[PDB]
Design a protein around this nucleic acid. Structure first.
Ligand SMILES: [K+]
Ligand SMILES: [K+]
Ligand SMILES: [K+]
Ligand SMILES: [K+]
Ligand SMILES: [Mg+2]
Ligand SMILES: [Mg+2]
Ligand SMILES: [Mg+2]
Ligand SMILES: [Mg+2]
Ligand SMILES: [Mg+2]
Ligand SMILES: [Mg+2]
Ligand SMILES: [Mg+2]
Ligand SMILES: [Mg+2]
Ligand SMILES: [Mg+2]
Ligand SMILES: [Mg+2]
Ligand SMILES: [Mg+2]
Ligand code: NA
Ligand code: NA
Lengths: 183, 141, 71, 130, 61
RNA sequence: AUUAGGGUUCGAUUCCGGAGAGGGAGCCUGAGAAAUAGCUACCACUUCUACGGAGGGCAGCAGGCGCGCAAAUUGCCCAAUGUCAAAACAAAACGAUGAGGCAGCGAAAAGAAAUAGAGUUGUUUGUCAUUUCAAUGGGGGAUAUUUAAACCCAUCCAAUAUCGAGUAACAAUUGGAGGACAAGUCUGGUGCCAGCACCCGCGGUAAUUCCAGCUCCAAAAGCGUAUAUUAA
């Protein structure tokens, strides 16, 4: 009753439920990137589709069209700052050829593993889930945190986490209480 | 072949209006004869009271007896024949008991080798006939 | 509009013929509208003529326009 | 790694504002407490903010809406301080005054006052409420 | 007709009852995806010209 | 909502316009009503009564009965937003508000996300039995924060001083495994029966389809079924 906030959707199920090629390809993306289910991939697919559709529209207008000149320039900034597109790729046609693995490459769970912080991509997810990593000195507890290129050098352990400037973690805390009580 | 004039929109509108009635799906959704004849009255489900149990001989080449019941709905009081979706479920249903009925999945069309059955029993005594069959819930009285 | 009927007293019926565009079929169709217009004795138009009308207050059950020219 | 340190609090103000309409100075206060087990109570912030802006008494400082940052170590909230205590008593809501300690007593049940009106409207004057 | 209303539930009864054997829990969530992934692409190797039988059964009759 | 485009379909429902207050019809006051938690009358229903008589209109909120396939609590508060008002707040001096705001119930629907992360030894990898290691949350609480007050979220497990995961039992389900359509030479009985089966079909004594175990498949805190509708 008179509630006025949007709640949209971010994913779509595949049209053909049982494709051997699609099921095996999606299972490869799950283990290789450490995802809990296929909805993360389908979220990525919807994310990539939307940029593709608006790009498709922009390339039909002349390069001097103010809508093309403004929204084309904007979508380049969105691609470069989030690391999706290489900075020397300046044309609007390189957005079209964007791929699914490129988007998950910028996920924090991927970047944490690739920076040497996490030995495995599954270690990265739980480590992020356990408030152990801070981006620009801000705790992030979400594996799907797409990181900008300018914030890549600020990735570190959170100053509150046991691995760093914070107090000791749970195991070193509960067992210490056990020894003191046993006295 | 059809009209192609620049100012011939009125003819093209009447052409589609007249010829849309030849679409059985379109005509059924835009006429009341289907809803007046449908026992459920345009609804998915409908409750009823069991009258008697009947065994229907399956169509050829199949040879079996399908357990079925005569059911009278409580909103229209019309005779229908429904189907029990598993084996050993005719014993669970007893005469003069509340059964929630549903469609057979083909939108008012007979399903399988059962000759004239377009409905199936979903509930009995406010309990799911599946859970009763699965030895998972018990019906009252 | 075009004078359609002058069978009343001090009143004429005019026709506003136009083309209506049906968006689905990308085509037009001929449409017409009728208006009851008060005609002063200064004009004396004939059937098939051409008049310019201007909106006034309700003069009768149907009249809301007055003749301004006869062409 | 980690060392034992005394809990400390830092006070910063953003968008300071002066208005003569209610005789108060309004700003937004952010709280920095890197090593603080829990969240900073408003009484302590009142003393630090009274000390910072050099007001004669802490009770003329009204602090409210202190929302904490995610990840810890930071809390932000709005706050206004008045020129005098008397103006604070004059210009403050009942819920904020009660939080400090000057709020008026709570009115009785609104259901009773609602019911009381409908009993009276059915009766003649001087017979309603005695 | 060889069929009757009184014959209902015959095979249900015919089937003798057999209990289900006990079993430990399997991993849930992201673990199952990564557990199956190591079976799909790491536990074995793919040989050209041969298709992997995803659930083969012992021979019998 | 769906959709390459053109289109098809839904719109009682939060904003705007109209209409009504059981059905009809008349009217006073008022700037404004053909007003209904205003009046008058009739028709249907109805309640109290001392039988003389007098009352009623939830398609407001909260809540009952029937109808149904079908839909919340007789909860808190004017703290915000606004309305009216003779009216800023304050001081014997605190206006009304079921509008509204905030909670309870609530798998309509939507976003982020648990059910674990690494090792040493034995049995190029990889499975299995070991030995452990550290971490966080669910949860328990608070110097307290939020809040009109609460509850929720956020902070913390002492700052001198703050509990807790190893079968981490803090145990994941729903449909399937002939084809469409991912997944079995395993079963075992029935023997065109019991059944399955949206369609094609399975079952007549070595059942591909029935009724179970294991495994496997698919989705996953979600998954079937029915009826509409869009694409196809
Ligand atoms: K929407
Ligand atoms: K006149
Ligand atoms: K309205
Ligand atoms: K089976
Ligand atoms: Mg509408
Ligand atoms: Mg209606
Ligand atoms: Mg009205
Ligand atoms: Mg009514
Ligand atoms: Mg009226
Ligand atoms: Mg009312
Ligand atoms: Mg009435
Ligand atoms: Mg109500
Ligand atoms: Mg067999
Ligand atoms: Mg289906
Ligand atoms: Mg369609
Ligand atoms: Na057959
Ligand atoms: Na037959």
């Amino acid at each position: 009753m008179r509630n006025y906030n949007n709640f949209n959707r971010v994913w779509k199920a595949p049209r053909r439920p049982f494709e051997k090629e699609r099921l095996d390809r999606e299972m490869k993306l799950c283990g290789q990137y450490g995802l809990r289910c296929k909805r993360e991939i389908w979220r990525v697919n919807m994310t990539l589709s939307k940029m593709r559709r608006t790009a498709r529209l922009l390339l039909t207008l002349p390069e001097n069209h103010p809508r093309r000149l403004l929204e084309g320039s904007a979508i380049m900034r969105r691609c470069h700052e989030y690391g999706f597109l290489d900075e020397e790729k300046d044309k609007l046609d390189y957005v079209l050829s964007l791929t699914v693995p490129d988007i998950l490459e910028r996920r924090l769970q991927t970047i944490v593993f690739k920076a040497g912080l996490a030995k495995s991509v599954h270690h990265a997810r739980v480590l992020i889930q356990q408030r152990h990593i801070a981006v620009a000195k801000q705790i992030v507890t979400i594996p799907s945190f797409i990181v900008r290129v300018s914030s890549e050098r600020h990735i570190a352990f959170a100053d509150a986490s046991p691995f760093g400037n914070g107090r000791t973690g749970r195991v070193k805390r509960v067992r210490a209480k056990a020894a003191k009580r046993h006295a | 072949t059809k009209t192609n004039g620049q100012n011939a929109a009125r003819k093209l509108v009447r052409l589609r209006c007249r010829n849309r009635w030849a679409d059985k799906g379109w005509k059924r959704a835009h006429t009341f004869s289907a809803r007046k004849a449908n026992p459920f009255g345009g609804s998915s489900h409908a409750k009823g009271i069991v009258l008697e149990k009947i065994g229907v001989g399956a169509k050829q080449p199949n040879s079996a007896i399908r357990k079925c019941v005569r059911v009278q709905l409580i909103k229209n009081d019309k005779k229908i024949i429904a189907f029990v979706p598993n084996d050993g479920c005719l014993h669970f249903i007893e005469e003069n008991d509340e059964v929630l009925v549903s469609g057979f999945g083909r939108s008012g069309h007979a399903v399988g080798d059962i000759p004239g059955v377009r409905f199936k029993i979903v509930k009995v005594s406010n309990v799911g006939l599946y859970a009763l069959y699965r030895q998972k819930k018990e019906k009252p009285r | 509009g075009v004078v359609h009927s002058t069978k009343m007293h001090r009143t004429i019926i005019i026709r506003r013929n136009y083309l209506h565009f049906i968006k689905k079929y990308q085509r037009y169709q001929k449409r017409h509208k009728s208006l009851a217009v008060h005609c002063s004795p200064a004009f004396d138009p004939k059937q098939g003529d051409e008049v310019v009308i201007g909106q006034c207050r309700p003069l009768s059950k149907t009249i809301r326009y007055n003749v301004l020219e006869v062409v | 790694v980690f060392q034992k340190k005394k809990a400390e609090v830092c006070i910063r103000t953003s968008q300071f504002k002066v208005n003569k309409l209610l005789n108060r100075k309004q700003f937004i206060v952010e709280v920095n407490h890197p090593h603080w087990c829990g969240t900073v109570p408003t009484q302590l912030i009142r003393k630090k903010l009274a000390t910072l802006y050099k007001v004669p008494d802490a009770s003329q400082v009204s602090l409210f809406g202190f929302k904490t940052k995610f990840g810890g170590g930071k809390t932000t909230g709005f706050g206004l301080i008045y020129d005098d205590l008397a103006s604070l008593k004059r210009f403050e809501p009942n819920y904020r005054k009660t939080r400090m300690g000057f709020g008026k007593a709570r009115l009785p049940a609104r259901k009773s006052v609602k019911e009381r009106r409908n009993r009276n409207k059915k009766l003649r004057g001087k017979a309603k409420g005695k | 007709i060889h069929g009757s209303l009184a014959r209902a539930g015959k095979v249900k009864n015919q089937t003798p009852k057999v209990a289900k054997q006990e079993k430990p829990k399997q991993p849930r969530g992201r673990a199952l995806k990564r557990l199956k992934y190591t079976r799909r692409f790491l536990s074995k190797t793919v040989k050209p010209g041969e298709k992997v039988h995803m659930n083969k059964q012992p021979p019998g009759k």
